[PDB]
Amino acid sequence: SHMPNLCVSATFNPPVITMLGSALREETVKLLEQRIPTPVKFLFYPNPDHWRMELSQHFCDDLHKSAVFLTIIEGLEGEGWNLRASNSIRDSESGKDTTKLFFARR
């Protein structure tokens, strides 16, 4: 170990954001839960340990999805997490798209 990474995954719609990473501190999660709506919360779950936020009453179009990704990337960069890679898929039957963002420590 000693090489911590972070994965943020975002599925739409409705928006469901998950954050995974062994060195991810709750204080980082709390900073992002204030940025993303700009009083919805991230809930913690184990195996694998992660934080999950669902915006049940929200619908994001392409522009607002771009804004969500940007706020996450900017918030995490300020916390010492650098963006290294991303990927995305769209599921034709559910009509949902999922995007993953991978970060490394500097």
Next chain:
Amino acid sequence: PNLCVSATFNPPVITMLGSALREETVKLLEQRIVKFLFYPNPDHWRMELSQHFCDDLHKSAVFLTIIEGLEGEGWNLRASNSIRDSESGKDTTKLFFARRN
């Protein structure tokens, strides 16, 4: 500061989000890639090429011009992703940039 550029085809619709994006950078891209129009909430620049059709090769050329234009302005490419929507027949690609500072 970071920047997200999103490009949907077809017709081409290019959106650029990032508070630190200069209007001078936007103008350089306009000449490289009709104009980008500014809109608030969220603050962004949007260019729509209604009378244009870009095939796979021209989509690659559009991405390259955007990346090269932004690199010269101090924005480094960090990641990308893409999806194709089977019902609309449209594909959307995102390009993420970070400042070299």
Next chain:
Amino acid sequence: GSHMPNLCVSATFNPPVITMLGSALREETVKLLEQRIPTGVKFLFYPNPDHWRMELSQHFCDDLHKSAVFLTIIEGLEGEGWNLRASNSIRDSESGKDTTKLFFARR
């Protein structure tokens, strides 16, 4: 082999099938990942193209566990001197399977 070797790790779901390509991938790295991935079974070697393959036949990874699998692979490989450079993913509507690729370069 002018300037530094590379790796490609591909993962298809479901069931999870992980493939690792790259001539410079040492068997010691493959063993470390074998211990890591279930925590988040062995890799078998096949030629033409040379690669390591692991199947988890009795497993069904939801989206969260897919993210955990990618993270364990990235972290394991980073500790071994392999830096993540890019990723991509597709979903096949007819098979219902998604495939994600992770590309690494030497430090």
Next chain:
Amino acid sequence: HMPNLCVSATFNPPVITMLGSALREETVKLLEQRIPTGVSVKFLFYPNPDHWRMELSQHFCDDLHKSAVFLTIIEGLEGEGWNLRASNSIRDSESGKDTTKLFFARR
């Protein structure tokens, strides 16, 4: 002013296109030799936009061979001074074709 390169690969049959004004023909020839070796043909030049295109009409690549093609391209380019920065991919359900893009920078 900074040169970048985009390599796009569509399957099946495999069609590889390379765009980037600063791409040397020596680099094109190197990849021309590497790509068939990864799966075991030439790249043709076309204008508007200027690019190199290779076909393998008599070939059908499974997911493993697609990974091998991407890896050979990345490794070949890295030796030529091109660093991998990003990738993306889509699958078209009606044509049954998948397209992957690989972006490289000289820096």
